[PDB]
Amino acid sequence: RDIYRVGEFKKFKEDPKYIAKEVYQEEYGRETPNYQSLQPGDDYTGRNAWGMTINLNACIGCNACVVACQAENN
C-alpha cells in the first residue's frame, strides 16, 4: 500500500515530484489522481489554519515525542 514513500536523491534533484508521479501511474495510469468529493467543507482563507508536517528523512524512532505527549496531555 501507499503508506511509506521512498525515493533516490539523484532522481529527486531533477524532479522533486517523481515519487508522487509513480504509484499514481501504477494505480490509475495517469500522473495525477483526480480525486473528486461530494462535500463542500469549509473555506479557511483569511483565518489561521493549524497544520503539521513530518519529515521521514529526519525521524529516527527515538520515541521522545511519545513521552512528551504523555507528559503534556495527562
Binding site: 501504477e26 494505480e27 490509475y28 495510469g29 489522481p33 480525486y35 473528486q36 468529493s37 461530494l38 462535500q39
Partner: protein, 396 residues
Amino acid sequence: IPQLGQVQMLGLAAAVIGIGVLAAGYFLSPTSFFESYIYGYYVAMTIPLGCLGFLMVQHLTGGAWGVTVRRMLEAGAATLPIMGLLFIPIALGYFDTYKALGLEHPLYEWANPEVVTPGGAEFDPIIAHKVPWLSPLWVTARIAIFFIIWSALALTLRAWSRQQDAGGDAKKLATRMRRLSGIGVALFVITVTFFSFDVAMSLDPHWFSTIYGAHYMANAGLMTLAFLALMMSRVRDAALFREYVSVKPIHDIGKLIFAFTVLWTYMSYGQLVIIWSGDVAEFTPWYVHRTQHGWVFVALALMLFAFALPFFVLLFRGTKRNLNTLATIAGWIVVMRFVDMAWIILPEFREHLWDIAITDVAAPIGLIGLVIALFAANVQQAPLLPLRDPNMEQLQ
C-alpha cells in the same frame, strides 16, 4: 380487440417514426446513433422483463390482480426473443466490427485495445484488471445465456397456459407453473442483475454499485405496472373483462403501483445516502456528473414529479379505484420513468443537458413502439383471462 388493433397501429407509427429519425441521426453522426440506441434498448427492455417477473411472481402468490392480467403478462413476456435479436447492433459495436459502421473508437471502454492491454497508449489499470470478465466474447456469451434462459422460461409458461385451456387445469398446469416460477424467480433475479451490470454499469468501469440492478428490477416493475394499467384502461370493454373483472383488481394494481413507487424511491435514496455520507473518491464521480451542467435539475424533477406527486395522489382510496384516473397517473409515471433512465444513462455520453440530441429521444420511442406492436399481436393471438384456472374463483 379493436382497441388493441388501434394501439398496435399507434405503436407501429411511433416505431417507424423513431427508426426513421434515428437513421437520419446515424447518417449525420454514426457514434451518436449507437449512444442513443443503448439508452433506447435499456428503456424498452423494461416492459418484457417486468412482465416476465410479475408473471412468475403472481404464479407463486396467486391473487385476483394476477389472474386479471395473466394473459397480458404472458403476451408481454413472449416478446423477449425478438429483443435478443435487437441486441445484435450493440454487440457489433464492442466487437471488431468497429472501424466500420462509422465508429472511430469502440462503443465500450473495455473493448478498446488501447486501454485494456498493458503498454497501450491509454492503459488504465482499473479497466484492464477486468480484461477476462469484461471481454466482448464473455459479455456476448453471458447475454446469450441470459436470453436463452428468459426465452425458455417465457415460452414454456405461455405454452403451459395455452394447454390449460384444453384440459387438466387443477391437477397439473397450475402446480407445474408454480414450481417453474419458484426456481425462475431466483434465476430471473441473477440474470437481470448481471444483465444490468453488463449493459449499463459497464459504461464507466471505474464505478460500481451493489444495489444497482435491484434498482433496475424495481424500475422495470414500476414501468410494466403503469403499462398494464394503461392497457387495462384501453381494453376495459372487451366482453371478457366486463363479465369477470370488478374494481378489486384495479384497486390492487393501483396499490402495487404505489408500493413500487415508494420502493424505487427507497432504493435510489439508499444508494444516494450511502455514497454521499461516505465520501469515498471511488464512488463520488457518479453523483458528480449527475449533479453537473444542469443534470441536477433532472434529479430534482424526479424527486418531486416522480415521488411526491405520485405518492400523494395514489395515497387516497380514489384515483386507484377509478381506472381512468389510474391510467392518467400511470401515463405520468411512464413519462417520468423515461427521464429517470435518461438521468442514469445519458450523462455518460452527452455530459451536458444541452448536448442531449434528438436521437436520445428517438431511440426510446422507436424501440418501445416495436415492443407495443409485438405485445398487441401476442395479446390478440389468444383470449384473455384463462377461464380454466383454479384461481379464477378469486375473481368472484
